[PDB]
Design a protein around this ligand. Sequence first.
Ligand SMILES: *[C@H](O)[C@H](CC(C)C)NC(=O)[C@H](CC(C)C)NC(=O)[C@H](CC(C)C)NC(=O)OCc1ccccc1
Ligand SMILES: *[C@H](O)[C@H](CC(C)C)NC(=O)[C@H](CC(C)C)NC(=O)[C@H](CC(C)C)NC(=O)OCc1ccccc1
Ligand SMILES: [Cl-]
Ligand code: NA
Lengths: 302, 305
Amino acid sequence: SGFRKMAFPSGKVEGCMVQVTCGTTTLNGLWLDDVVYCPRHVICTSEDMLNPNYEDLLIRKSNHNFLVQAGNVQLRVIGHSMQNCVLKLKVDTANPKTPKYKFVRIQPGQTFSVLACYNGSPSGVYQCAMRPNFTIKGSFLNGSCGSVGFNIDYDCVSFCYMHHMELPTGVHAGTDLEGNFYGPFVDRQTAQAAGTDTTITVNVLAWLYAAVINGDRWFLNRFTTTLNDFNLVAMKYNYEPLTQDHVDILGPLSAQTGIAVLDMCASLKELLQNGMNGRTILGSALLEDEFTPFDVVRQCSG
Amino acid sequence: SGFRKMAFPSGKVEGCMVQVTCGTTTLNGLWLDDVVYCPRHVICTSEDMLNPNYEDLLIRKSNHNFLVQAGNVQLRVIGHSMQNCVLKLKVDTANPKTPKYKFVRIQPGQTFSVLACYNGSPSGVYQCAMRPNFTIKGSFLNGSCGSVGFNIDYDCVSFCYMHHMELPTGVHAGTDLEGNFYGPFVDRQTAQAAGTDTTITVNVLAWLYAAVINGDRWFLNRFTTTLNDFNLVAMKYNYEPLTQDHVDILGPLSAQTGIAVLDMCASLKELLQNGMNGRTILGSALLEDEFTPFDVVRQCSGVTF
Ligand SMILES: *[C@H](O)[C@H](CC(C)C)NC(=O)[C@H](CC(C)C)NC(=O)[C@H](CC(C)C)NC(=O)OCc1ccccc1
Ligand SMILES: *[C@H](O)[C@H](CC(C)C)NC(=O)[C@H](CC(C)C)NC(=O)[C@H](CC(C)C)NC(=O)OCc1ccccc1
Ligand SMILES: [Cl-]
Ligand code: NA
């Protein structure tokens, strides 16, 4: 029993982290096979942070302008290419620690683990979610760019996030590993802001099911709701719409607990109206929205 | 910026986890040098787990009774012994992935990372605190026994916890790597219960400093207090006493934020007596007590391993 914010074991990713320096800028890169992936803004100077022409900057670089360090070994860059906002440095040695891996672009509400790194070395691992406004609420300092987010269902590492920037509210933006930003953001220091964030309703419901599985029932009630009535209420609390896809997705947890999805929706309605009145759910005094239905099943059943 | 519950990178420990099978029980072992450590109750039975004589149960055991698997490779057991509640299986091969490590026993209020494993395969990592009642609030399913907790200090892994059991409230109990239980617990399926728990005051203060470092300042106030005065309030609300050593340990965060510990204690004193008035701190509506002062400094300064 028990329920924790759990990250994937980070060792398979640790073995891929390197340090990339261009000019006076150092950040992290991801070394897979004979390619190092990193944010393309490593090639910016203090002068072109607002409107960098990355194509023009990169054509001026020699391979020896990129210093790549894997632990105590310098890697030799033998070519480079830009893919959207990611730089791909070809090196003369394949990473012997390359795991089985793939690249996946995720949807809002999905969770993943982040291995926060500085100078190619890991500082720690934590769990994040892609917020509906396409930011993540990370923990990142100067030099953290190139840190990645990943999942490891089974024995294959799915890389889904590379860190690029921090926005004014202290939240974070980045790309998939094909270099496409999540959300409308750009790798320029022109004024940008995250949209109003909202709560990931389907994840809250998954977590309420986790609470029931772990033996807590105090928030249940005798009522049900229609889906449309639920969404009309939840939208008043800046909750995301619940779709029929989400209802289908919650079917298994519904079957395991004997609580119909729309009955659990009426519980959430009451919690939004009343709060917790001094009680907690799974050790929290707020409704938690960074566990997915898949996460709950994985942690509760295995 | 940002502040998350952050575990240590787990790679060094993942290379040490193996599967141990005895009879019909399978759980996890920790393979370091030429020894595999695991809970001694791996040798118990469906018909033998209420009042076990471990001493006598182990002599009937022999080496090939213990099936140890490192990934898809069997390790040959060449000896076995018991130390307190931990079994030590000597194997014929030293683990080539053994990190720099030591065994340590931690104090209540200290935090560590748990690498949750099943069938010898790491499945997840999360951060925990040794509660003042010597339980941990973990997440463990059947087959998780032998999962370990650890810290990393520079390049050295300090192993501090091995998982043995779950108590009726859904909290967890285990041993150090020398087999001594944390808390007044025994590896028997006899009636046991977690004692009443308390809140780890020095950790709450550290987390308030983390909040200030991240721009959450509403709870700061003009007042200061004394160690004596605050500790009476703490006692009243089931908070652990604040010692002078705690005050000194927070000193760095005190110097960097401008908020003396007794200045911050006055903030905490008011949060206890009055609550949070509907507000949140670092995204929580509760006072968080599973970050140590060291954890806050590490995360906010970007220490690496
Ligand atoms: C890479 O290590 C670093 C990580 C941060 C977490 C510090 N990223 C950057 O420095 C990044 C480089 C640019 C070219 C993508 N810049 C930012 O993230 C920057 C904040 C820094 C300077 C602390 N953010 C930014 O420019 O956001 C756009 C913006 C500009 C002006 C007003 C509002 C928003
Ligand atoms: C090892 O994988 C497993 C971990 C659990 C989290 C499943 N440990 C055990 O099965 C363990 C073995 C005993 C000899 C220490 N037993 C328990 O943890 C057991 C709960 C199981 C059956 C889920 N708990 C227990 O014995 O607690 C004391 C108790 C017993 C009966 C009544 C009150 C209290
Ligand atoms: Cl005063
Ligand atoms: Na004060």
